[PDB]
Automatic annotation (TrEMBL):
This is rRNA N-glycosylase. The keyword Hydrolase applies. CMP binds at Y70, I71, E85, Y111, E112, R163. Glycans are attached at N227. The gene is RIP. Guanine binds at I71, G109, E160, R163. Adenine 2 binds at I71, G109. CTP binds at Y70, I71, E85, N110, Y111, E112, R122, E160, R163. L-ascorbate binds at I71, G109, Y111. GO terms for molecular function: nucleotide binding; rRNA N-glycosylase activity; toxin activity.
Length: 246
């Protein structure tokens, strides 16, 4: 398991949590020095538990699929909540079995469905450590509309930060003040699967992407990533989705 406490949290303790999260994801291989997530894992070993504590010390446990860093569901007190999708339904066979009741959320876990449920795109939702504290608090008491927004925050400040150093840093910059994600942040989130794939395809293609990946940079400018010498590959991305899952 990995843990993070918002009480007394700072950029350093958050960085340690994101390091712990990355290190809890198994791999047998690196591709261009980036851990390659496994094609599959069987049984309960597929799911990592993140223990998150809000400022007042209340807690939820979030279940993460270790092959793709997707949040499957979470436990709040004696109630479990899972996304309305087959991967989460399967996860419900292995985690939070001792919950007194299980609620299936009225949406799947993808950004499009969560944004619909929440009533807004995540371009408009502030993220940061304060937003994470709020998210945890919201998820403690069932409200499916409020939960969608909280889950958008949760996913970005945990999974997306684990996947990209740039995103981890953006959240560190928002340790004490929330701010909507940069366009670059959104672009990276949207491109994780594409980049993971193209980095793997570059292995037998002299480090060259078969298909370029278009991103937005820090300065708001749209850029083409064509090969593994780009900073996105050498510095930023920290985990690759196995091409067998793409
Ligand atoms: C590869 O990407 C680098 C870094 O962005 C770029 O400067 C260069 O023109 C590209 N080289 C090749 C061989 O594609």
């Amino acid at each position: 398991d990995v843990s993070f406490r918002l009480s007394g949290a700072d950029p350093s303790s958050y960085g340690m949590f994101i390091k712990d999260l990355r290190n809890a994801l198994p791999h047998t291989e690196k591709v261009y020095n980036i851990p390659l997530l496994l094609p599959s894992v069987s049984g309960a070993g597929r799911y990592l538990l993140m223990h998150l504590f809000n400022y007042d010390g209340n807690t939820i446990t979030v279940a993460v699929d270790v092959t793709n860093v997707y949040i499957m569901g979470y436990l709040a007190l004696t109630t479990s909540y899972f996304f309305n999708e087959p991967a989460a339904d399967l996860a419900s066979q292995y985690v939070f079995r001792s919950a007194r009741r299980k609620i299936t959320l009225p949406y799947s876990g993808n950004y499009e469905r969560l944004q619909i449920a929440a009533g807004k795109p995540r371009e408009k939702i502030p993220i940061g450590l304060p937003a994470l504290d709020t998210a945890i608090s919201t998820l403690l008491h069932y409200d499916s509309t409020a939960a969608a927004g909280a889950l958008l925050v949760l996913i970005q400040t945990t999974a997306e930060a684990a996947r990209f150093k740039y995103i981890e840093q953006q959240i560190q910059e928002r340790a004490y003040r929330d701010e909507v994600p940069s366009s670059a942040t959104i672009s990276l989130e949207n491109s994780w699967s594409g980049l993971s794939k193209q980095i793997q395809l570059a292995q037998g293609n002299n480090g060259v992407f078969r298909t370029p990946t278009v991103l937005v940079d820090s300065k708001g400018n749209r850029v083409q990533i064509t090969n593994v010498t780009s900073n996105v590959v050498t510095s930023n991305i920290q985990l690759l989705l196995n091409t067998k899952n793409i």
